[PDB]
Amino acid sequence: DYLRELLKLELQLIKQYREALEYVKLPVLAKILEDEEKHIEWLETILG
């Protein structure tokens, strides 16, 4: 579950990232997004 909990925060994280991106074209914001998306696939992979 610890792993679910992180998958949960990350998923909460991106949304807020994506919110900013509805409004501002800030490439560094889009670049964090991309890592978290990676970050979230590893979680899913290791959750099975």
Residues that bind Mn ion (CB under 5 A): 10, 36, 39
Question: How wide is the angle at C-alpha 12 spanned by C-alphas 34 and 26, nearest 5°?
Answer: 40
Minimum gap (Å) between residue 48 Cβ and a second copy: 14
Minimum gap (Å) between residue 30 Cβ and a second copy: 12
The smaller minimum CB distance to Mn ion, of residues 30 and 36, is found at: 36
Render 8-36 in DSSP notation, one character per residue.
HHHHHHHHHHHHHHHH---HHHHHHHHHH
Using CB under 8 A, pick the residue from 4, 25, 28, 48 that binds a second copy: 28
